[PDB]
């Protein structure tokens, strides 16, 4: 009975560790900051599972199961847990999930704020590549920063009514939207460059990083067309007046 | 339900347990009249085509309730039959109308995400390749990705 | 490998036939070196999930060959054994971390349409009642109609 | 062996004829044009079968 209890405890710990590691906090889950937070949560769950396994009660239960011939149960609990992988992932994603350049880009919907937030996303991708965070993770951080910058630019344009602005106001709004899209693309490129540095550091594993960019350029082109068309409308009004 | 009871007597221990004959947990679950009622409903009634069985270990004491619907929990070796047919024929085996499958003892959310990713969508894709299906597969994959993002 | 052979003996015979273990045809199919390598790959690698074992009857001789791939042969009563775990471990769950899907002896178009209608769509309906899911259900309905049209 | 092959081939040919002549408009899949196209294809396949 006690040997079966120790083996079942080892197996349950392995199942809990596998369930904790199964919730992968990828960069696709939310923005770059959302992916960093998900990776931090997964690493924390892995560290908690590892602490529960390595606690003295867990060690005593494992020893009792092994003495009771539950070597298969102990091996299943060890293989299904992945506590070492969880601890390594927590250590690697700790220096990459802390940075919040994507949120800074989202808050700074303007051109300068978007450029600063994209630079922050690229720097977070570079720091994650320097740490144990994946090159794909850094590229996803850059892409999430670019998408957040694009969404912030769209929300600010909707709030300010830049599509239906006046001549100068619409020209400034189109310039701001184009700058937001360009800053998001540049931040995605910087995150991809940091991920490429990480992949170069891990050439055996890290195959490559995505172009990321943002998620706008089309909005900026439309705003530039609208500003040019407004200038043409003013010139044509002057020509018709003459 | 004779073939249905025969399948759960050996295949479930080979699936829910480490393998072999049924342990005391499955024996007590079948000894509970609810499991027999679920088996009788599956064999006779075509409208009711759901049942569950579990052989768990609780700190180990095993107190499991087997019902007439699919169930799962935590650290429990649940087992439910995917009855594609409504009732069970007398000439055919009783278990031949219910695809018996045992649940895993890992986290059910991640296991369900993996099952949606590579069990229903993969089946639709296999049927299409043997021959809509891609749209259903994409919807299942989107649901799995959303579940993973919410759990993370 | 050997574990996959034992699982196919204890599962497919209860699925393809009326019940039992791997027959002389099934044992000879599993005894092929390439079939054994395919079973080892299915029970070890995570990429290989569906495992097919057929109890065929060619005009009604009992002589079958096992393989990783699934094909619609002459009265090939295949049984898709889709594994959920990356490997079939002896200590960790294997059959609970797998499943048994039954394929007809003939081509699987009508059986697949019936499974989409009453085992995939009904399963999605049960999951929704317990609750991209409506998109999956509508796409499954469209794919079932298309599969019926193609089989007919 | 020839008779068994004849039976199997007759089954296969009947299946091919039914598949050619059964691709009709679905009860809820497609519009009126799609249903009419399925019906016309089924008519041609039925004549051929």
Swiss-Prot record, chain D:
Effect caused by changing residue 25 to L: In SMALED1; slight increased BICD2-binding
Taxonomic superkingdom: Eukaryota
Disulfide bond residue pairs: none
Cellular compartments annotated: Cytoplasm, Cytoskeleton
Purpose: Cytoplasmic dynein 1 acts as a motor for the intracellular retrograde motility of vesicles and organelles along microtubules. Dynein has ATPase activity; the force-producing power stroke is thought to occur on release of ADP. Plays a role in mitotic spindle assembly and metaphase plate congression.
Disorder noted: Charcot-Marie-Tooth disease, axonal, type 2O: An axonal form of Charcot-Marie-Tooth disease, a disorder of the peripheral nervous system, characterized by progressive weakness and atrophy, initially of the peroneal muscles and later of the distal muscles of the arms. Charcot-Marie-Tooth disease is classified in two main groups on the basis of electrophysiologic properties and histopathology: primary peripheral demyelinating neuropathies (designated CMT1 when they are dominantly inherited) and primary peripheral axonal neuropathies (CMT2).
Binding partners and assembly: Homodimer. The cytoplasmic dynein 1 complex consists of two catalytic heavy chains (HCs) and a number of non-catalytic subunits presented by intermediate chains (ICs), light intermediate chains (LICs) and light chains (LCs); the composition seems to vary in respect to the IC, LIC and LC composition. The heavy chain homodimer serves as a scaffold for the probable homodimeric assembly of the respective non-catalytic subunits. The ICs and LICs bind directly to the HC dimer and dynein LCs assemble on the IC dimer. Interacts with DYNC1LI1; DYNC1LI1 and DYNC1LI2 bind mutually exclusive to DYNC1H1.
Domain notes from UniProt: Dynein heavy chains probably consist of an N-terminal stem (which binds cargo and interacts with other dynein components), and the head or motor domain. The motor contains six tandemly-linked AAA domains in the head, which form a ring. A stalk-like structure (formed by two of the coiled coil domains) protrudes between AAA 4 and AAA 5 and terminates in a microtubule-binding site. A seventh domain may also contribute to this ring; it is not clear whether the N-terminus or the C-terminus forms this extra domain.
Family statement drawn from the similarity comment of this UniProt entry: Belongs to the dynein heavy chain family.
Record-given protein name: Cytoplasmic dynein 1 heavy chain 1
Organism encoding this protein: Homo sapiens (Human)
Name of encoding gene: DYNC1H1
Interval of the full protein contained in this chain: 240 to 288 of 4646
């Amino acid at each position: 009975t006690f040997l079966n209890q120790l083996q079942s405890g080892v197996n349950r710990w392995i199942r809990e560790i596998q369930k904790v590691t199964k919730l992968d906090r990828d960069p696709a889950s939310g923005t770059a900051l959302q992916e960093i937070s998900f990776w931090l949560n997964l690493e924390r769950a892995l560290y908690r599972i590892q602490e529960k396994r390595e606690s003295p009660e867990v060690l005593l239960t494992l020893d009792i199961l092994k003495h009771g011939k539950r070597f298969h149960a102990t091996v299943s609990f060890d293989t299904d847990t992945g506590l070492k992988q969880a601890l390594e992932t927590v250590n690697d994603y700790n220096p990459l999930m802390k940075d919040f350049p994507l949120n800074d880009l989202l808050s700074a919907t303007e051109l300068d704020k978007i450029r600063q937030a994209l630079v922050a996303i690229f720097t977070h991708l570079r720091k994650i590549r320097n740490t144990k965070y994946p090159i794909q993770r850094a590229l996803r951080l850059v892409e999430a920063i670019s998408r957040d910058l694009s969404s912030q630019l769209l929300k600010v344009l909707g709030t300010r009514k830049l599509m239906h602005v006046a001549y100068e106001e619409f020209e400034k709004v189109m310039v701001a939207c184009f700058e937001v899209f360009q800053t998001w693309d540049d931040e995605y490129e910087k995150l991809q460059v940091l991920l490429r540095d990480i992949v170069k550091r891990k050439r055996e594993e890290n195959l490559k990083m995505v172009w990321r960019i943002n998620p706008h350029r089309k909005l900026q082109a439309r705003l530039d067309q609208m500003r040019k068309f407004r200038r043409q409308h003013e010139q044509l009004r002057a020509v018709i007046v003459r | 339900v004779s073939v249905l009871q025969k399948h759960l007597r050996k295949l479930v221990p080979l699936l829910l347990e480490d393998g072999g004959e049924a342990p005391a947990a499955l024996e007590a679950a079948l000894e509970e009249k609810s499991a027999l009622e679920q088996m009788r409903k599956f064999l006779s009634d075509p409208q009711v085509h759901t049942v569950l069985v579990e052989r768990s270990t609780l700190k180990e004491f095993i107190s499991y309730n087997i019902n007439i619907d699919i169930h799962y929990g935590v650290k429990s070796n649940s087992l439910a039959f995917i009855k594609r047919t409504p009732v069970i024929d007398a000439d055919k085996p009783v278990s031949s109308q219910l695809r018996v499958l045992t649940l895993s003892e890992d986290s059910p959310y991640e296991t369900l995400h993996s099952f949606i990713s590579n069990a229903v969508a993969p089946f639709f894709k296999s049927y299409i390749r043997e021959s809509m299906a891609p749209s259903v597969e994409k919807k299942i994959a989107e649901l799995e990705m959303g579940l993973l993002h919410l759990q993370q």
